[PDB]
Design a protein around this ligand. Structure first.
Ligand SMILES: Nc1nc2c(ncn2[C@@H]2O[C@H](COP(=O)(O)O[C@H]3[C@@H](O)[C@H](n4ccc(=O)[nH]c4=O)O[C@@H]3CO)[C@H]3CC(O)(O)C[C@H]32)c(=O)[nH]1
Ligand SMILES: [Cl-]
Ligand SMILES: [Cl-]
Ligand SMILES: [Cl-]
Length: 395
């Protein structure tokens, strides 16, 4: 049990760099822990100690309480918006001040961690939405993998009519809304103001609500989509690439991965980037900062990125990982790894505002739930969302 190996390693260690994370289980936790085990074996009297804090929400709550207690870890996972918050407390060390080489890091990921031209996180476990599908059910009715939004809606209506149930499955959440929002032309910032109730937002939440009404879209309200498979016919979902191993373990059908449906066949749809960067806290000792620096270079190494990404479905964050021969041997046998990397080229982010975490869940996520689960009018729901977000941003 890797966490027991680590406990051993950290008992013999004079310097311990804690890494707080939001991995609850599955291949993400196993892959992170095996990376830490390998790192700690190459050290003398130093170690990284991974500390699970629950999910990502629990992680941000515990880090906020750790600032209030004056007792922060050396390292933590953080979304771009949590970085924006931690920078208000001036709590983060610039990554290049530690001497970490960032050559070859995907500019899409590195751009997203740059604040005032300064890098404040290391892209580590970065995910892109993909189209998951049931290869067996598409073949069953002679439906091609949809390459456009128009094709995707047609195929969902057609398969749902043949199978007697809604076959496009979705969580009624900010993450899923962002796929429809972005690919119908929407943008959250207008002249620097945050806007949740633009016509593209209404149009996106309307298309989901219409899907449920019309019997082709199924809201999943208890657990992840991959925890609901096996009850009812499933054709498609739009979901994190980091769900890959979870879909594989649950599916009693032949699982497919495709690039997202776009406006036209000229380009795949944009996917929402999720997963986290590693930050290093100023309050960490020099010695703890030197462990973090060596661990961040480890995790950016082509071999660590190849193993991590092929174990999980996360996007390798470096050009070097794609040339690593362990990556190439898995990719030669499994085209899904190339599909995920191809989708990572068509990538959008939610806004990196200090307050975004609270807005995405308690305000925008609530509006999407009211519209889908209580049939609130999309516009009235999003107009409330806007007002709640302006009041929060004002305060
Ligand atoms: N706190 C906070 N969360 C945020 C923010 N922006 C986006 N997200 C959340 O990132 C999750 C995506 O991050 P990702 O690393 O791609 O995927 C996660 C898991 O989601 C996914 N998972 C786990 C278990 C399972 O059975 N199935 C499965 O797919 O595996 C990974 C490790 O747990 C979304 C999902 C969400 O948690 O509902 C809310 C979303 C933010 O600003 N703050
Ligand atoms: Cl069944
Ligand atoms: Cl079956
Ligand atoms: Cl109101």
């Amino acid at each position: 049990k890797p966490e027991d190996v680590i406990k051993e390693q950290c008992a013999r260690a004079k310097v311990v760099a804690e890494l707080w994370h939001g991995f609850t289980g599955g291949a993400p936790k196993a892959a992170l822990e095996n990376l830490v085990v390998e790192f700690n074996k190459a050290q003398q009297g130093r170690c990284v100690r991974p500390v699970p804090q629950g999910g990502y929400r629990d992680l941000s709550t515990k880090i906020k309480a750790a600032f209030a207690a004056g007792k922060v870890p050396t390292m933590a996972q953080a979304f771009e918006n949590n970085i924006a918050l931690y920078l208000e407390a001036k709590a983060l060390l610039p990554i290049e001040s530690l001497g970490v080489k960032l050559q070859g890091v995907n500019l899409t990921f590195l751009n997203a961690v740059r604040f005032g031209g300064v890098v404040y996180g290391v892209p580590f476990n970065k995910s892109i939405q993909v189209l998951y599908y049931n290869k067996d059910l598409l073949k069953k009715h002679g439906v091609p993998v949809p390459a456009t939004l128009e094709e995707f809606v047609a195929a969902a209506k057609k398969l749902s009519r043949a199978e007697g149930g809604p076959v496009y499955w979705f969580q009624p959440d900010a993450s899923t809304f962002a796929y429809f929002f972005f690919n119908l032309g929407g943008s959250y910032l207008k002249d620097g103001k945050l806007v949740l109730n633009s016509k593209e937002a209404v149009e996106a939440l309307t298309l989901l609500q219409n899907g449920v009404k019309e019997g082709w879209a199924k809201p999943i309200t208890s657990g992840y989509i991959n925890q609901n498979l096996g009850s009812g016919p499933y054709a498609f979902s739009v979901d994190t690439s980091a769900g890959y191993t979870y879909y594989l373990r649950a599916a009693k059908f032949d699982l497919g991965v495709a690039t997202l449906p776009g406006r036209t066949k000229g380009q795949p749809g944009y996917g929402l980037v999720q997963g986290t960067n590693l930050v290093v806290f100023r309050q960490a000792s020099k010695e703890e900062q030197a462990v973090a620096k060596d661990f961040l270079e480890f995790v950016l190494s082509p071999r660590a990125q190849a193993v991590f990404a092929t174990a999980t479905g996360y996007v390798p964050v470096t050009e070097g990982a794609l040339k690593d021969p362990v990556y190439q041997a898995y990719a030669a046998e499994n085209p899904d790894y190339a599909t995920i990397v191809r989708q990572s080229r068509y990538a959008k982010f939610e806004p990196a505002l200090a307050e975004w975490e609270q807005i995405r869940f308690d305000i925008l996520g609530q509006a999407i739930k009211e519209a889908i689960l209580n049939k609130a009018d999309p516009k009235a729901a999003l107009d409330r969302a806007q007002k709640l977000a302006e009041d929060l941003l004002s305060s």
